């Protein structure tokens, strides 16, 4: 019946401090060690540290130069402060309750796992500047012997925020079209690509255009994609 | 590589059983007990196993755990579609932190295995005129939805500059992903080729491109 709930800002500017709080309800901070764990989108889990109800802490060495945690047993809350953030800190942050082994020597508490978790809160490290994409044509490679099929594409580079739409030939071309989900880059910006597979026979009689729309920036590009090579 | 190591993916048909390995060392599993988590994307990990072999209330008995030496094992019997998820092992490491394995995607096989189609594009002349270069590796129609991507410059591994998406389900129920390699124009021009190598179910499909102008 114990529940944990994260509270956090959502967006944080690079170089500034990320602050989160976890509220424990239907239970108490008293008598437990408490942790933060984070997970960048699509990636693995990283433990940040633990704090005991009495205030003693232990932090992941990878973060020691930037992190601290505090506890407010009176409000049944504990908190995280992570300084000097960059895009590498964009992640869902979870608070959790810990278990493991306690040594009465210098080792103290060894955190072996987490039995109760909050729902997690996304923190995005970004200036939040609206930025339209550059659109680059991905020309079909040179291919002989009737050529069979050809793959042509568009690279939709460095935009923020999501989403972007891509069509081909104003929607007339759907067969063989594949638009891929975006990658979120270490720059904090997105990129995605779209490719269409077409018959080689008509590369000279059919024009191919990728129609890109990034609504947030009102960026609309109609990019002709054609075979290169001299 | 990370402190704890797991196979990136495991799969079996419904009703079958699987195991998932967790490879550690004397500094972690050798000295401390292993916990395991199930995570459905979009939600928090859920504790499945603690103290190597114990189940919390609510976890059915077809989940099991064991530990031997500096390794641990999660077992799942009677696979159901709902078991599809990412599974993680964890314990304390002597570097003074809790460490997690990299995660194992469990797929409950519902269609034929399918190898990925790979398409690789070189940097466009337009991007190169902006003093940038991106190699684009597009990966589609694979199942189960897990791949590992490796890039080569000439015949040498590249690590820096690679960003790869999570696989996403296509309309046809197979999966897609993409991998981007950012380079300077000098790097692009100064290798004879680059390759995107996609490994799926232990078989590698690779494509290669090379600088070419007029």
């Amino acid at each position: 019946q114990v529940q944990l709930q994260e509270s956090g800002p959502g967006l944080v500017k690079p170089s500034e401090t990320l602050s989160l709080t976890c509220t424990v309800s239907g239970g108490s901070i008293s008598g437990f060690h408490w942790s933060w764990i984070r997970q960048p989108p699509g990636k693995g889990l990283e433990y940040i540290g633990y704090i005991y109800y009495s205030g003693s802490t232990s932090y992941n060495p990878s973060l020691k130069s930037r992190v601290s945690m505090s506890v407010d047993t009176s409000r049944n809350q504990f908190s995280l402060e992570l300084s000097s953030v960059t895009a590498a800190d964009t992640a869902v942050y979870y608070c959790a309750r810990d278990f493991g082994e306690y040594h009465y020597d210098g080792r103290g508490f060894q955190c072996e796992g987490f039995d109760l978790w909050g729902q997690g809160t996304l923190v995005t490290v970004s200036s939040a500047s609206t930025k339209g994409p550059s659109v680059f044509p991905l020309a079909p490679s040179s291919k002989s012997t009737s050529g069979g099929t050809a793959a042509l594409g568009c690279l939709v580079k460095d935009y923020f925020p999501e989403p972007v739409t891509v069509s081909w030939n104003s929607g007339a071309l759907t067969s063989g079209v594949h638009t891929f989900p975006a990658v979120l880059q270490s720059s904090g910006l997105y990129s995605l690509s779209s490719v269409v597979t077409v018959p080689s026979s008509s590369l000279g009689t059919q024009t191919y255009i990728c129609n890109v729309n990034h609504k947030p920036s009102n960026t609309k590009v109609d990019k002709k994609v054609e075979p290169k090579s001299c | 590589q990370s402190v704890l190591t797991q196979p990136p993916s495991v799969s079996a048909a419904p009703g079958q059983k699987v195991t998932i390995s967790c490879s550690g060392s004397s500094s972690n599993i050798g000295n401390n007990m292993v916990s395991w988590y199930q995570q459905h994307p979009g939600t928090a990990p859920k504790l499945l196993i603690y103290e190597n072999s114990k189940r919390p209330s609510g976890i059915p008995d077809r989940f099991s755990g064991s530990r031997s030496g500096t390794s641990a094992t999660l077992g799942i019997i009677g696979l159901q579609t709902g078991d599809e998820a990412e599974y993680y092992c964890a314990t304390w490491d002597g570097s003074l932190r809790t460490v997690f394995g990299g995660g194992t995607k469990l797929t409950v096989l519902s269609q034929p295995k399918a190898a990925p189609s790979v398409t690789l594009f070189p940097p466009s002349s337009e991007e190169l005129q902006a003093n940038k270069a991106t190699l684009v590796c597009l990966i589609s129609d694979f199942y189960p939805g897990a791949v590992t991507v490796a890039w080569k410059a000439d015949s040498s591994p590249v690590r820096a500059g690679v960003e790869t998406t999570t696989p996403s389900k296509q309309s046809n129920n197979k999966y897609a992903a993409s991998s981007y390699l950012s380079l300077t124009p000098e790097q692009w021009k100064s290798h004879r080729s680059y390759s995107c190598q996609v490994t799926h179910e232990g078989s590698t499909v690779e494509k290669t491109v090379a600088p070419t102008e007029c």
Binding site: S30, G31, F32, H33, Y52, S54, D98, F99, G100, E101, Y102, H103, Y104, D105, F109, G113, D115 | L47, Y50, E51, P56
Partner: peptide, 12 residues
Amino acid sequence: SIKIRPRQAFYA
């Protein structure tokens, strides 16, 4: 020296 089980409050 001692296990702290899940859900087990512990006061050193």
